[PDB]
Amino acid sequence: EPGRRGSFVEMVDNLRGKSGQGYYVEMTVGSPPQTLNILVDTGSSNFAVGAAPHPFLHRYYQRQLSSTYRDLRKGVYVPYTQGKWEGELGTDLVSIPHGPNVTVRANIAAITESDKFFINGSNWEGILGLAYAEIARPDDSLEPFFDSLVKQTHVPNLFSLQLCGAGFPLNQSEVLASVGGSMIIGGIDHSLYTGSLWYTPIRREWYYEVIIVRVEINGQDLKMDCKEYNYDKSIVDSGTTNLRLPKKVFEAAVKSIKAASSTEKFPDGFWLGEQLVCWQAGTTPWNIFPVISLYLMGEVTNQSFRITILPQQYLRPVEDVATSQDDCYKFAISQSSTGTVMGAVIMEGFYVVFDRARKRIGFAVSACHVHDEFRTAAVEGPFVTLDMEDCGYNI
Ligand SMILES: CCCN(CCC)C(=O)c1cc(C)cc(C(=O)N[C@@H](Cc2cc(F)cc(F)c2)[C@@H](O)CNCc2cccc(OC)c2)c1
After folding, report:
1. Measuring CA to CA, how many Å separate 184 from each of 44, 156, 163, 283, 313?
2. Ligand 1 pocket: which residues have CB below 6 Å?
3. Same-domain status, 161 and 173
4. Which residue range or ranges hold the Peptidase A1 domain?
């Protein structure tokens, strides 16, 4: 054996927030620096910040107060799965207080109009799209923040995320004081995970696309054409709460999860991810819910590995409408019409390494994943898997 050291203490514990409202990191924009909390989103590629008054904002980017502000004289529109905003493009000096000790000039979309974007009480005022230029708006000529970072400094072309779910509800005061995780810019901090890191190839450099080759519910093969699992794509996305699955896969998965948890009957509203279910304080029946294993393509030919999540991950802690002492949760898995989305829910169980330089994504059991005395999340390998390329979808 050998104890693994944590070499990025300055960036450890630099995140705050929760799955339902998003995880954010502190950043500064302009000269003098204007502090803003920014949502970490591996599912988009635009750096955008509120730049005008809004009901849900306590602060915003004030361009006229920045001596280093540069107007690009260009508008920008970004529509997400849910949520959208319109803004004005420009560049300015950006820094990350609890990140690498550097300052870089990056593109910034000054949000002037929005709909269902900002979240009341999230405590964040903007978003950091960490994906590739291909999906950046207006087009791929608008260099993403991380690309600027790497091009302008010596920071390694890699970042890692440790999203830490509390395992229980956090009120407004609590979520503000609590440590929500870590975003290590330019490296891998070994104190953030246990066990080994397994890498799956980044299929294409647009979203952080990966390939799922097998799915199990308590060891039982969901037994679908693996191509179904990646229809029309599978991505790792910190900006979305739930595990989102292709319609057909969702239907099959819910049927299996229901069968595994059949000793307890849950209302349709629960399975739709709409209504919460509650249990007397401390009696949540974790054991009746199955673990979910997702096999991912490995870096070695015909080899895969699997990540296993617990219901402590796919059941999201929520406060009871009556703020009682019961432990309540919502089913954090929903259907998609745009492929698989490995959201915040899933990421909370693992330390995820976005190794841009080597075009791969690594997974390891998170040092902060919620579990019980009987089961733990896992990252295991290797497995002999054939024709994995056929699992990928082509339009
Ligand atoms: C995370 C806080 C809770 N929310 C939002 C409030 C209900 C969700 O769980 C959620 C739910 C759905 C169902 C989509 C998105 C969604 O679109 N997320 C965005 C980021 C985000 C947007 C927002 F408006 C508010 C937020 F908090 C977070 C990206 O992760 C999407 N990546 C894929 C994609 C899809 C289409 C276009 C695209 O552009 C490149 C990227 C987010």
Report:
1. 18, 11, 11, 36, 22
2. 20-22, 39, 41, 43-45, 80-83, 117, 119, 135, 237, 239-242
3. yes
4. 23-364
